[PDB]
């Protein structure tokens, strides 16, 4: 009995994987980028990057490979969906048209194994004979490739070692061999096996096991002329190959860990390394011929090259240009020359792409959007007008935001990391202001302490007027600005909670309030409390904050003295809280959404209905009066209802689930507004970076759009042979149900792209409807976003 | 008549 | 240390970190909670009037609960609501085990004291197979990947398949009074676990071996000296021995006065005794927490059960202490105290008078 509509306004921008090779032809370089569910293909020219194709995929992309079977000219792709799909694609240039052909497709999924806490790992044999898939713990998967496995059969093999970190295929062997790093309560070691595709067993293993450091997390396979493997860990770069052992311990690798790697030369003499601070590194190998024989390495050396953004996918294109992907900031394009500029760097920049990054909080003000973005050293506020994006850089990690209409200023809570011998690292925006005030409240070596402060941002040219640093080991989590009681002045209210790094959950907090009237902000009330103030929302003139699994409603006397009125100790760690006008509110974070009511005749909370079948939540929003919205961490959406019935013991106390969906993203925040015939408009942001919009159509356009959605799937051609029904249906670890309710959105919006001859294949029998008479309903819906 | 307690039924 | 504070865990989750076991730590925290709270028992209304309940088992994902009764039928209810949805009916005498199929869908087996296996299909469908000497069926266990079913009749194992009308393998146990009582598998379907009678000249004892079933090799039970794990123990039904969800732990009730012990099943310390405790001669059931950090022991003769938390790693009588005390919300006994599969949803115990109740945690 619920009908909603979801449409994407901005495609995902964060990059989670990139590969390079020869795909379009045999005489051109191709760079392939897949953000979350997209697939961008570029051609690397001398001037820069030229785009040629961008296709969408049903399901998120989690692993990409690029191999070359014997007896061919152009290579073939390999993409596996996080929903455990599989496909092998090619590239065809038919005159002036470019389409992607599918050669093999199938499903590989086991309903027994648990998902390991490392991610899906995919490795392909350099000789193009095997494909490895480490999906579940202790289970290996082998896919033979003999131009006969058109359905991609597989057979699982047992692994005794449970904890596995990284797996790679070695070079220069007469049979497929693998090596990996496993962990047990003795210390991580490295062991190697030998996969047999004719007997389905691990036969011998080419060399004995060793002992490595306590933080080794990466394995690199060197090319043929050297042979062996490279393991890089925290302050330990090791080498093992048969009977050979070389190790180094540079001191310029201590402050940060290594994440990514990418080969540079086709011989293995040059490597690139990254870290979660920038610090583009560079590995070197030394060659030495031994009379009449092969080459043996002499020593290894690592040198600095400069700084970049936080990297998650690194590659070397050609001639000295390097593409750097990112997920917490922007993706750049750098050039490595042979010289030394001022301050001693070898890296310059010439391009900078756009990425909304992890949208933590979002607000609507006049339509216009002001949102937080990024984390650590990269990320700041963004202004999405109406889709021009304005960046106002600040070197901190924003957490929340709010707005007042009486002072023309925002409010942002940020964090800043500084180690002690406490003097920071780089000039940030939380310190370089024209006013500061340390919160004085007498009420209560080599480490990395975090400090939080509240800064006020004027909105005329986005300056930074005032800053207010909190106490030691004190985090800020909730902020709101509103009126209170009977007092003609708007205040600033911030909730906080002290965190100790040792034990459990916090047990203390504060409800400090502020007032930035003339030139600065003062403090009028603290009201120390026992618990964490995860969230707080302004009621009809009373405070309402969930205090660490306890919902309180604070009043406000004449003088500044906050005093509680009610108490509802029933929930377990209720973080998120929203209300709509009346005495309606919600809960979350250890169950599904429940509903409470406030009775003004006698101050007390009255439980109305709580929904069972636990679901971990990420954001809750109320739609009109009864249609509730939630967002599970399993990348799904659902809508609840009050379930009108009459039993007085099993009715009016159960919330019926009348809608399920699979967005595929991680919804982080909801809001009310519209940038630009439905009723209502709700926006949301995602971790990967995406703006959507949920509307509602009353009772009739649903039976016309759902009827078109089924018939539109038999004329469109999916890139990997997916029917769009398996992808968009509530896929959890255990349960799986078809999606009823939400319409497909972008699938309907794509109807205005197919050519005219294919138009008279859909809507052939429902007057009787025509192409011209129905090419305007899509136009009416293509103005909401 | 099968006993109602699990500790006195034969099997 | 992979972080210990929820504030820094949610912060990492919000920006897509996924480092280490964040979800595991959150589940451990939510199970450490629900310890200072209170529990209320909600009853279940059954169609007919059963005078006793024996065994409980759950759905293959998480969302259904089965039940047996002396009334010669099997009832299936719903966990979320608490109402029966199906009433099987069809057996001649009381069943002894259910063994919900773990993999595909809604497939439920059933034993009896006359030698019948039904293999119901819920929404229509039922088969049958009979013994040759009107012997009872101790237990059954399915196989996750392959198409195979094991039946614990008198001292044979039949390895039946529900495609044809007859089994295809028979394995003996030498002498005739060494019967089989437990054939439960492992969560990943890589190992077996049998429990046969130890021969003697007093009360009967059992032996639990740990056979290997990796390459579908028929185990040889005729040898009583290979792959011993526990030696003496006491078994009543399928609820007298439980394996943790991860499969890294195994409980037992070895005697001599009965003492409780749990043995690790890891390949490197397979056989260590670890935790231990002494109980009286009235413990009937034992169940483990979904995360393997809490153990509930059902009592029979008011008090219903006791819950302990494993604390000290490798010995000492101080290991695990009382933290809980569940009470009947009023000559009544208890035959099952199994934990719900969800990490911290509640309890569910049977009643000697024929009552099924579900307990849930509530605050002050």
Residue numbers in the entry:
A (entry chain A): 1 to 366, 373 to 392, 710 to 744, 749 to 771, 782 to 1013, 1023 to 1112, 1122 to 1140
B (entry chain E): 285 to 295
C (entry chain B): 4 to 204, 856 to 910, 918 to 962, 973 to 1001, 1008 to 1041
Quote the study's own text.
AMBRA1 acts as a substrate recognition subunit of the CRL4DDB1 E3 ligase complex and facilitates the ubiquitination and proteasomal degradation of its target proteins. AMBRA1 recognizes and ubiquitinates the C-terminal phosphodegron of D-type cyclins that contain a highly conserved threonine at position 286 (1, 10, 12). The damage-specific DNA binding protein 1 (DDB1) acts as an integral component of the Cullin4A/B (CUL4A/B)–RING E3 ubiquitin ligase (CRL4) complex. AMBRA1 contains a “split” WD40 domain (AMBRA1WD40) consisting of two halves separated by a long, intrinsically disordered region.
To understand AMBRA1 substrate recognition, we determined the structure of the cyclin D1–CDK4 in complex with AMBRA1WD40 domain and DDB1 (DDB1-AMBRA1WD40) by single-particle cryo-EM at a resolution of 3.55 Å. The protein complex was purified from Expi293F cells by coexpressing the human AMBRA1 WD40 domain with full-length cyclin D1, CDK4EE, and DDB1. The resulting electron density map allowed unambiguous tracing of the AMBRA1WD40 domain, the BPA and BPC domains of DDB1, and the extreme C terminus of cyclin D1, allowing us to build a reliable atomic model. The density for most of the cyclin D1–CDK4EE subcomplex was not visible, probably due to its flexibility, and only the last 11 residues of cyclin D1 assume well-defined conformation in the electron density map. The interaction between AMBRA1 and DDB1 is mediated by the helix-loop-helix motif located at the N terminus of AMBRA1 (residues E6 to K41). This motif inserts in the binding pocket formed between the BPA and BPC double propeller of DDB1. From the overall structure, the extreme C-terminal region of cyclin D1 (residues C285 to I295) binds in a turn-like conformation to the top surface of AMBRA1WD40 and covers the central pore of the β-propeller. The interaction interface between cyclin D1 C terminus and AMBRA1WD40 spans across blades I and II and extends to the center of the β-propeller. The pThr286 (phosphorylated Thr286) phosphate group interacts with the side chains of R96 and H75 and forms hydrogen bond with the backbone NH of T97 in AMBRA1WD40. The residues that follow the phosphorylation site adopt a turn-like conformation, which is immediately followed by a single-turn 310 helix formed by residues D289 to D292.
